[PDB]
Amino acid sequence: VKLRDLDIIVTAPPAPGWGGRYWILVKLTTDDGITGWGECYAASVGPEAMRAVIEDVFARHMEGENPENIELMFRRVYSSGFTQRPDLTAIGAFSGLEIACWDILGKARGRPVWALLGGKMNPRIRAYTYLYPLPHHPITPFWTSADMAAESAADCVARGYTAVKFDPAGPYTLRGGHMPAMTDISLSVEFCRKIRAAVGDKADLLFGTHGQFTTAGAIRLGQAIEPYSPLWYEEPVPPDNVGAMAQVARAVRIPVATGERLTTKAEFAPVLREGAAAILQPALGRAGGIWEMKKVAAMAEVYNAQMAPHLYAGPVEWAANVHFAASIPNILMCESIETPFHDALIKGSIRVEGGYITPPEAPGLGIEVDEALARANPYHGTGLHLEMQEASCDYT
Amino acid sequence: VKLRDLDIIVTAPPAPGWGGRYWILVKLTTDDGITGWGECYAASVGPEAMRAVIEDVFARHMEGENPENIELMFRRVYSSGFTQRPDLTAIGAFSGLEIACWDILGKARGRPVWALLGGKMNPRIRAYTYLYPLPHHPITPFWTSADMAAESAADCVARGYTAVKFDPAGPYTLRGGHMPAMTDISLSVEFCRKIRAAVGDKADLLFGTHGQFTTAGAIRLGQAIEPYSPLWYEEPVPPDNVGAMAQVARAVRIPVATGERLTTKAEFAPVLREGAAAILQPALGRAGGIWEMKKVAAMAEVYNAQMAPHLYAGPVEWAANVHFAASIPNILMCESIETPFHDALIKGSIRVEGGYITPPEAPGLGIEVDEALARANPYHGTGLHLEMQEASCDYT
Amino acid sequence: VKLRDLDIIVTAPPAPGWGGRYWILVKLTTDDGITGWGECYAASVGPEAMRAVIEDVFARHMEGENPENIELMFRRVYSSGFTQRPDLTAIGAFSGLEIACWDILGKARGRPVWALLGGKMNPRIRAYTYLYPLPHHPITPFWTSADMAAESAADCVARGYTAVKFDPAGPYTLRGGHMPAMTDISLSVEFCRKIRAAVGDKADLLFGTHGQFTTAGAIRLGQAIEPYSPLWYEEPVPPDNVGAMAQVARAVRIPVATGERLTTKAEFAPVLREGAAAILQPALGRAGGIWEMKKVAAMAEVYNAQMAPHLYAGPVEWAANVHFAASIPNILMCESIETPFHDALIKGSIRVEGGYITPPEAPGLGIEVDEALARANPYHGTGLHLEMQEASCDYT
Amino acid sequence: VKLRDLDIIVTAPPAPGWGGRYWILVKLTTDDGITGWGECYAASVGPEAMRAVIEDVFARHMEGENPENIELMFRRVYSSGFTQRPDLTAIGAFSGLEIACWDILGKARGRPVWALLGGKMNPRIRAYTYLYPLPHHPITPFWTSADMAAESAADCVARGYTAVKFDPAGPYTLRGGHMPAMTDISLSVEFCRKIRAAVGDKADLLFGTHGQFTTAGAIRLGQAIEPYSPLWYEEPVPPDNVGAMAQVARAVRIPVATGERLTTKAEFAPVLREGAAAILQPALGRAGGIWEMKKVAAMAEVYNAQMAPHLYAGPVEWAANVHFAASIPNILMCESIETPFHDALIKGSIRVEGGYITPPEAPGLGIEVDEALARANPYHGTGLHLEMQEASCDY
Amino acid sequence: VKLRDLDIIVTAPPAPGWGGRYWILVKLTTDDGITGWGECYAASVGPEAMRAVIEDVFARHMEGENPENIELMFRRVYSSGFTQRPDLTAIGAFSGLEIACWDILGKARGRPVWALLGGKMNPRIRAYTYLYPLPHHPITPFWTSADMAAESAADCVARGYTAVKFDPAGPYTLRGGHMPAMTDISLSVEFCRKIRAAVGDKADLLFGTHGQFTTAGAIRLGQAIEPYSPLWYEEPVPPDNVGAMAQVARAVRIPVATGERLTTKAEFAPVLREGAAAILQPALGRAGGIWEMKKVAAMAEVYNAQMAPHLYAGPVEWAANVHFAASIPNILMCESIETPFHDALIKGSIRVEGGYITPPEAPGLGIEVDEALARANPYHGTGLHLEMQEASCDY
Ligand SMILES: OC[C@H]1O[C@@H](O)[C@H](O)[C@@H]1O
Ligand SMILES: OC[C@H]1O[C@@H](O)[C@H](O)[C@@H]1O
Ligand SMILES: OC[C@H]1O[C@@H](O)[C@H](O)[C@@H]1O
Ligand SMILES: OC[C@H]1O[C@@H](O)[C@H](O)[C@@H]1O
Ligand SMILES: OC[C@H]1O[C@@H](O)[C@H](O)[C@@H]1O
Ligand SMILES: OC[C@H]1O[C@@H](O)[C@H](O)[C@@H]1O
Ligand SMILES: [Mg+2]
Ligand SMILES: [Mg+2]
Ligand SMILES: [Mg+2]
Ligand SMILES: [Mg+2]
Ligand SMILES: [Mg+2]
């Protein structure tokens, strides 16, 4: 078969909007009518600019191609316009389209995507979630309340989650790395202490930092939270300096996790080689798609390192994560977001049950995308999927 | 003053089209009506998608801002959408806009841009050019003809050039690095031998490769051309592997030059640190603009390394290169392209004279852009500025 | 479907016998009657012991399993008996069985194997061959005759080959590395000189050493042959010391190729990481099979390195090489052996044509194995596929 | 003399089966009637296939050879079939045969094997044991019971042992390294705390992990057990990544020990060179035999590192360990397993006495193998000596 | 048996005295009357002081000991007086005594020494020699004559030698490394050119420098001789800086050989680890003896490096080299000196024949030492075995 048609749907999750301001869905159709769904993860520019980028990438490198030719299509986009180094925006476009190709391939083969990726390694995939406000928690105060976070952790654990994520360490800003305030450090310690007291040995603590810090700052914060045995320390520094992250990794006793803002094996390889991270967290809708991330997973294997696929986006990218995770021996866990809208968008096709995800057995990604629901929920705002503060860190 | 309006003009150089399929010009206007001109260098996606990207970057991060705030505007774009690592496409958009800001600043200050960048280091800037066919040379056979290249080289020296560039080493393809054919090596040797014979000591040879090669291939080719004392070996490998390039630099006795496909100090710093290149060749319309490249020039200084700004684009980016070059102690030379169209587009405001460029004394970039000429030459081709071949290297 | 039956056929090539004393072929049959062919490359012990080893591996880890589960089956064999490090014999057994699984998968999917491996990268694959005696050459004197080798090189070029391999450097012995005799060095120079004269730019020289040498000896030999621009220097030292090989790589101006005696990504990753080789030459019937070697090919990509699959065995392993090579962007060339028996054994299903190989379009490996022919050619000797002599290097 | 005959006996230890499902014994006879016994440690494939491998290795490289020629026979097998890099299965076959050659050599020389290896360094060799259930302990609950492990440790100390080993860190699986569960870490801390309280300064704690973990996971577990001063941290990661293990060694304050799944000096040298381990634990029946391990012991010397020969097998390999250990300056301790079957199989010829082993003075390995007993205890299972679980870690 | 008696004999080789001013022979006798011969290589102080050192070492650490206990006796001497780091003089004394122990052990075992060292690897051992004046060559002009050296080289080849050594690079002085004169480089080039022309492919050139040079000077000299493909570049810098030798190794395309002035595995291990030398040339009478060098040979194996035992001493140390070399898979070649005195002192027991040495089959070192001849040739001078001049390099 040959790829023929592209539809792009930008959809806005209802309030409180866990998973960001909008999700960029792509729907591909072959010349014989098979449809595949994918999801792009790219917000350097807004959704309208992303539409033009996606349409270009598809028309230029993919339209009329056999969807089997995943290596070739990656090379075309990766090399586009005499580049042949990672383009964060163009590869974001490609990744979503590549995921749709896998959905198509599974349907054409009559097999789930994982069955095409070296088969099943994992009959059940360990899941985790951020700590989100419970219904009685005021949303804004929740983010700096250790007490409320501990309640959310207790509820996650009751529900079967074996790991929970939180970031009490303060705002990320556009200036780059900063030194944490003493209050950021003490709050981070309070969170770890209270969450550990609430979950005991029943769950791991995932310290979900957002690249806020200088190397110096990341080390000072890291050392303070060591006594609570967090399973990982995520993005301790901004994503533009592998050497700086390896410095943090060598100086703190907590495993460093990173990858959500990185793209292609050309960026993941140095992270491993320099010892910057032990746990890789690519967003498949950003990092080059399923096949490219299989290449990265194999690289992680020879460093005795593991994958933990990123999710702060919709259930389509999450379905890609699940098939990917089902097929690799070095899976740690899959980030997950439980909301009515996430579930409804794929008609409950794949779910976290008792803290774990069972790989679907249906063909392709094993999802039924509610296209009507996505279209009934357009994005009207002027913001990006996520945004970085302009105001500096508060020391007063 | 504040940045107010943006106009984007995509212009096609007339046949034979030295400088690529199209140039992306940007024109900014302040709220007091000062106009500034810049040029973007970004072709992962085509002109129409780039229009949308540039509009987004301007409206989101720059509209309404004081043009003095160059550090701030860079931080905004660089961090946009929770990224804060180089985005080749978004920073390409910013870079052109940043150059227009400098044009505006120079006009507001009543000074040439170089005077705002630490003043004048270089009363004259050494230029170079590719070897282009002479009026009596057939175009297609020229590129693989050592005899014709040598004739072109003699002509360049007659007109005062002290350095000439050529790439006789074969096609660059989307597959990534390949091993050169024996004929690629022999042709490269023949070019270097005959061009050296033609120029003697009057000019340097610049071996202007396009990242065609595996590390192994780059070393085999490099050792073969060493006897002709080429001043530099440009992009010996693809731009997505700093360690690989450093392996070439250590294994060949020719200084390695690179950078036209890199962006921001976050990418240039590791190139220096690992010893991947001795000469840095940013395209200012790609790499973050003038101020960001001043940062890189300072970094090159503490490696006893030099800048050689890239030009395979229009005279507006070139003008930016000139002001940048004029203000740095560690300038090697400025890539230049002499066509009637280049000259006409800036109304002969800045020219190579006897192999050298005098920094302009007029305010701003010191150019008068022929906007009418640009608009009379629209681009409506289907191709990208430059493109990478799909067919493999030919060994037969 | 499920794997059900295994047949093992050990076949001896007739005269002149290029490709070793015997080939170990495996035939797998599923519960629904689909057949797949593979080939094991393992001769630490003889074919009778290997038959017992292959039976054990299949029954313990593979019988009853869905052939899709390539990741899982590799993990089972690789970890077998609380090992989980490379076992050369056990993995040799698995590799052939794994290749047969791929033949089955392609047949089940109705697609060529390469189509299941990320699709087609290479519509034509560059082949090479050893220099073999011409009909007018006495066989034994051929191996040390530079004059005859040159004739054979010209012959290969006339056949359309673009690279030729030869080893004039003397015997490999069980003692480990030795220093070459002055005669070994002079003969190697004479070979390179006369072969280069005979082929000019029409073909590459592949210096096909067999790990005879101490690090010191390999460097002395390497420097002597540099003037002839050999494309690679194969196994300059024994395969049991990555650091020693990297020392050679750094001290010689020729790219180092290795891998035929290595197994799994666990061994190939340090080779890349330490810069021991630029070109990886796994024997797929030894190194863990097709999928494991796709993992290695991906690792080679992030070192800007290439694959050149090894062949000193039958056409079944070669078929695996072809499908593997068809699917990777970083293919250099495929080692090939053109004998009447190789061709007859797969009924001319896949052939070298004018120095290149077209990937087959038929399902699975795209071969029709002549089982009757393999069975009519049993192995009756007491030797191993290849053997290392006991007598030392001859300096007198 | 010349090696002429090989006999292979696969024997199964009676329940509870401390030492694994089966032991592969080899018996070599020279042309003038001297017999030597050795033991192979190799289970990538089962005993049936191993018989075929052993027969091949012996017939091809050793039959008809003078047993003095240990360097040559090693080179022959190591290089077999144009290989000349470690083959886990072929070298496991060779190792047992090589041990048997040393038994023969000792007998022909009229000297204990240690006497031929540079002489006696160690009049008494420090022994250690795993913690095994006491008679009143239920077998299954014992492995996760810190209380019972502490009781067993106290008993070990009362019998003279100065070091004890235990692994409470959870299952090893075929998937490769995993992250420990919080309960794996807490249980490991509980074991270390209670065993340390039970033994005080009277014994060392040996944290006998089985390569279960990712580098990250091994560092998290390792840091938690540091306060109890464990003497070593064994196989913290799988045996297929020297760089990963070196990362653990640099990041935890406990000496790393490894080697039971490694083979030949070609694999032990990089471990030392990269600082992956401070203590080397080859299984002599796997790693290339006695002489190859003397080479490794010498390499360990120039890294100020020590040897601790592995034992999860029979008394024959153990006897090889003792002679090896007696002859080296850099011995730490010898792993030992005390069962009635181990003792009976070598007719009580060598024994742990009060936590230490005296090198025997009799010729060869100084053992009398009860061949009849070995033959009366055949292996009837379908499994391997040890096996790796398919199911993942339980969180 | 136990070591009981020590006799020291210092003997001077007659003019022209190839092999140095004197050789230090040691003779050990066991309590049951077995005799063993060894040779010490130690010249920091003269023969009389060395006598006192050897007597002390023997009486303190070895007398009354079973000669089997080679590991233990080395540890004793190595650690003597709270040292436990290489003492050139003390270990030089031990080394000769250790060689004598091996002679005794072989006699007691009824086997050649090589048979006790892992058996035979090499049925014949490749030999080499310095280029010595031919009978019609004037001795003094010979050392700086490329023409005469080439004649001697052609003669060596006619006699079956496959490698020849020479040093045209100038004097070694007590000052330490110096820069070669242009004439030193030119003469070295002339030597290499003319010797290569005389031997073609029939022999290797061994550039046998004596540590004359600074790192810079060694690199300038090394690059100039590269075109003639010398097999090795011996001791390019003084033996007291591993990092400096490694700098030469990385900067010249010739393999570096060293070790004659080094002692124990503690010094050879860093040489390998840092990549300072690819070929190791211990003098067994200096470096710790046969067993200690077997440890070093095993270390060389895991660096894919080789041994070339040093000889500028008597036939007793040479006998030790031969047995050592016979037993190791990684032998390159054995330095040899053919003089009437060498041959007579061991009664022609072991000889170079057609450029190769056959390991003896007789018990022990397989030599019959002419004790009477040794005593008939005492050393009468006041000098040292070799000496370093005080005058600087001549520019
Ligand atoms: O600048 C170096 C690059 O490496 C990666 O860590 C980041 O993507 C960054 O862009
Ligand atoms: O691939 C690693 C990064 O380094 C740079 O060389 C490339 O642009 C890439 O983004
Ligand atoms: O794969 C690398 C090797 O290092 C050693 O630790 C293992 O034996 C493995 O085979
Ligand atoms: O000896 C260590 C390993 O490195 C690799 O080069 C060989 O396969 C060997 O097994
Ligand atoms: O000079 C430092 C040490 O290194 C060795 O090379 C020398 O023997 C010396 O003792
Ligand atoms: O072992 C190498 C040398 O360095 C010093 O530490 C020792 O004394 C020894 O002589
Ligand atoms: Mg995150
Ligand atoms: Mg260029
Ligand atoms: Mg080969
Ligand atoms: Mg263990
Ligand atoms: Mg010397």
mmCIF file with all atom_site columns, N, CA and C in Angstrom, chain E residues 8-29:
data_model
loop_
_atom_site.group_PDB
_atom_site.id
_atom_site.type_symbol
_atom_site.label_atom_id
_atom_site.label_alt_id
_atom_site.label_comp_id
_atom_site.label_asym_id
_atom_site.label_entity_id
_atom_site.label_seq_id
_atom_site.pdbx_PDB_ins_code
_atom_site.Cartn_x
_atom_site.Cartn_y
_atom_site.Cartn_z
_atom_site.occupancy
_atom_site.B_iso_or_equiv
_atom_site.pdbx_formal_charge
_atom_site.auth_seq_id
_atom_site.auth_comp_id
_atom_site.auth_asym_id
_atom_site.auth_atom_id
_atom_site.pdbx_PDB_model_num
ATOM 1  N N  . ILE E 1 8  ? 79.093 -18.483 46.264 1.00 0.00 ? 8  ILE E N  1
ATOM 2  C CA . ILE E 1 8  ? 79.077 -17.400 45.286 1.00 0.00 ? 8  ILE E CA 1
ATOM 3  C C  . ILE E 1 8  ? 80.393 -17.396 44.524 1.00 0.00 ? 8  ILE E C  1
ATOM 4  N N  . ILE E 1 9  ? 80.301 -17.419 43.196 1.00 0.00 ? 9  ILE E N  1
ATOM 5  C CA . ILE E 1 9  ? 81.484 -17.324 42.348 1.00 0.00 ? 9  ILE E CA 1
ATOM 6  C C  . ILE E 1 9  ? 81.330 -16.161 41.367 1.00 0.00 ? 9  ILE E C  1
ATOM 7  N N  . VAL E 1 10 ? 82.232 -15.191 41.478 1.00 0.00 ? 10 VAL E N  1
ATOM 8  C CA . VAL E 1 10 ? 82.284 -14.077 40.545 1.00 0.00 ? 10 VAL E CA 1
ATOM 9  C C  . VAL E 1 10 ? 83.354 -14.383 39.503 1.00 0.00 ? 10 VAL E C  1
ATOM 10 N N  . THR E 1 11 ? 82.940 -14.459 38.241 1.00 0.00 ? 11 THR E N  1
ATOM 11 C CA . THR E 1 11 ? 83.855 -14.823 37.158 1.00 0.00 ? 11 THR E CA 1
ATOM 12 C C  . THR E 1 11 ? 83.924 -13.762 36.053 1.00 0.00 ? 11 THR E C  1
ATOM 13 N N  . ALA E 1 12 ? 85.135 -13.520 35.553 1.00 0.00 ? 12 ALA E N  1
ATOM 14 C CA . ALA E 1 12 ? 85.362 -12.540 34.494 1.00 0.00 ? 12 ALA E CA 1
ATOM 15 C C  . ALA E 1 12 ? 85.554 -13.213 33.138 1.00 0.00 ? 12 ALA E C  1
ATOM 16 N N  . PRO E 1 13 ? 84.758 -12.805 32.137 1.00 0.00 ? 13 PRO E N  1
ATOM 17 C CA . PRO E 1 13 ? 84.963 -13.310 30.779 1.00 0.00 ? 13 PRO E CA 1
ATOM 18 C C  . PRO E 1 13 ? 86.240 -12.726 30.165 1.00 0.00 ? 13 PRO E C  1
ATOM 19 N N  . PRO E 1 14 ? 87.067 -13.572 29.525 1.00 0.00 ? 14 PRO E N  1
ATOM 20 C CA . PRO E 1 14 ? 88.281 -13.075 28.873 1.00 0.00 ? 14 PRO E CA 1
ATOM 21 C C  . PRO E 1 14 ? 87.978 -12.018 27.812 1.00 0.00 ? 14 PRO E C  1
ATOM 22 N N  . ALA E 1 15 ? 88.984 -11.203 27.489 1.00 0.00 ? 15 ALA E N  1
ATOM 23 C CA . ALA E 1 15 ? 88.912 -10.252 26.376 1.00 0.00 ? 15 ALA E CA 1
ATOM 24 C C  . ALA E 1 15 ? 88.408 -10.960 25.111 1.00 0.00 ? 15 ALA E C  1
ATOM 25 N N  . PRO E 1 16 ? 87.565 -10.282 24.303 1.00 0.00 ? 16 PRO E N  1
ATOM 26 C CA . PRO E 1 16 ? 87.096 -8.887  24.403 1.00 0.00 ? 16 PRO E CA 1
ATOM 27 C C  . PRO E 1 16 ? 85.996 -8.656  25.448 1.00 0.00 ? 16 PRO E C  1
ATOM 28 N N  . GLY E 1 17 ? 85.568 -9.730  26.109 1.00 0.00 ? 17 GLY E N  1
ATOM 29 C CA . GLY E 1 17 ? 84.677 -9.624  27.257 1.00 0.00 ? 17 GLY E CA 1
ATOM 30 C C  . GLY E 1 17 ? 83.228 -9.340  26.927 1.00 0.00 ? 17 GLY E C  1
ATOM 31 N N  . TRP E 1 18 ? 82.743 -9.904  25.820 1.00 0.00 ? 18 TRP E N  1
ATOM 32 C CA . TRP E 1 18 ? 81.330 -9.783  25.465 1.00 0.00 ? 18 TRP E CA 1
ATOM 33 C C  . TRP E 1 18 ? 80.479 -10.369 26.587 1.00 0.00 ? 18 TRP E C  1
ATOM 34 N N  . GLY E 1 19 ? 79.606 -9.535  27.145 1.00 0.00 ? 19 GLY E N  1
ATOM 35 C CA . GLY E 1 19 ? 78.743 -9.939  28.251 1.00 0.00 ? 19 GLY E CA 1
ATOM 36 C C  . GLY E 1 19 ? 79.042 -9.228  29.558 1.00 0.00 ? 19 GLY E C  1
ATOM 37 N N  . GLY E 1 20 ? 79.996 -8.299  29.531 1.00 0.00 ? 20 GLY E N  1
ATOM 38 C CA . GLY E 1 20 ? 80.279 -7.450  30.685 1.00 0.00 ? 20 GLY E CA 1
ATOM 39 C C  . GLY E 1 20 ? 81.559 -7.813  31.413 1.00 0.00 ? 20 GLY E C  1
ATOM 40 N N  . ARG E 1 21 ? 81.861 -7.070  32.474 1.00 0.00 ? 21 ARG E N  1
ATOM 41 C CA . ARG E 1 21 ? 83.119 -7.240  33.215 1.00 0.00 ? 21 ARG E CA 1
ATOM 42 C C  . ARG E 1 21 ? 83.186 -8.529  34.035 1.00 0.00 ? 21 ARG E C  1
ATOM 43 N N  . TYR E 1 22 ? 82.056 -8.927  34.611 1.00 0.00 ? 22 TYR E N  1
ATOM 44 C CA . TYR E 1 22 ? 82.001 -10.115 35.457 1.00 0.00 ? 22 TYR E CA 1
ATOM 45 C C  . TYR E 1 22 ? 80.577 -10.655 35.520 1.00 0.00 ? 22 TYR E C  1
ATOM 46 N N  . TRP E 1 23 ? 80.461 -11.938 35.851 1.00 0.00 ? 23 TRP E N  1
ATOM 47 C CA . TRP E 1 23 ? 79.169 -12.566 36.081 1.00 0.00 ? 23 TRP E CA 1
ATOM 48 C C  . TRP E 1 23 ? 79.098 -13.080 37.517 1.00 0.00 ? 23 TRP E C  1
ATOM 49 N N  . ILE E 1 24 ? 77.936 -12.905 38.145 1.00 0.00 ? 24 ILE E N  1
ATOM 50 C CA . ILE E 1 24 ? 77.740 -13.345 39.521 1.00 0.00 ? 24 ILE E CA 1
ATOM 51 C C  . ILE E 1 24 ? 76.992 -14.668 39.506 1.00 0.00 ? 24 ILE E C  1
ATOM 52 N N  . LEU E 1 25 ? 77.726 -15.749 39.742 1.00 0.00 ? 25 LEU E N  1
ATOM 53 C CA . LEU E 1 25 ? 77.138 -17.077 39.781 1.00 0.00 ? 25 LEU E CA 1
ATOM 54 C C  . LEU E 1 25 ? 76.842 -17.468 41.219 1.00 0.00 ? 25 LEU E C  1
ATOM 55 N N  . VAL E 1 26 ? 75.712 -18.136 41.416 1.00 0.00 ? 26 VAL E N  1
ATOM 56 C CA . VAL E 1 26 ? 75.392 -18.694 42.717 1.00 0.00 ? 26 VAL E CA 1
ATOM 57 C C  . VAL E 1 26 ? 75.145 -20.189 42.592 1.00 0.00 ? 26 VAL E C  1
ATOM 58 N N  . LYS E 1 27 ? 75.617 -20.919 43.596 1.00 0.00 ? 27 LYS E N  1
ATOM 59 C CA . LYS E 1 27 ? 75.476 -22.362 43.668 1.00 0.00 ? 27 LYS E CA 1
ATOM 60 C C  . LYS E 1 27 ? 74.813 -22.741 44.989 1.00 0.00 ? 27 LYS E C  1
ATOM 61 N N  . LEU E 1 28 ? 73.632 -23.344 44.899 1.00 0.00 ? 28 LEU E N  1
ATOM 62 C CA . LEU E 1 28 ? 72.899 -23.808 46.074 1.00 0.00 ? 28 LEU E CA 1
ATOM 63 C C  . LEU E 1 28 ? 72.967 -25.322 46.200 1.00 0.00 ? 28 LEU E C  1
ATOM 64 N N  . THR E 1 29 ? 73.087 -25.796 47.438 1.00 0.00 ? 29 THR E N  1
ATOM 65 C CA . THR E 1 29 ? 73.061 -27.218 47.722 1.00 0.00 ? 29 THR E CA 1
ATOM 66 C C  . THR E 1 29 ? 71.972 -27.498 48.749 1.00 0.00 ? 29 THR E C  1
#
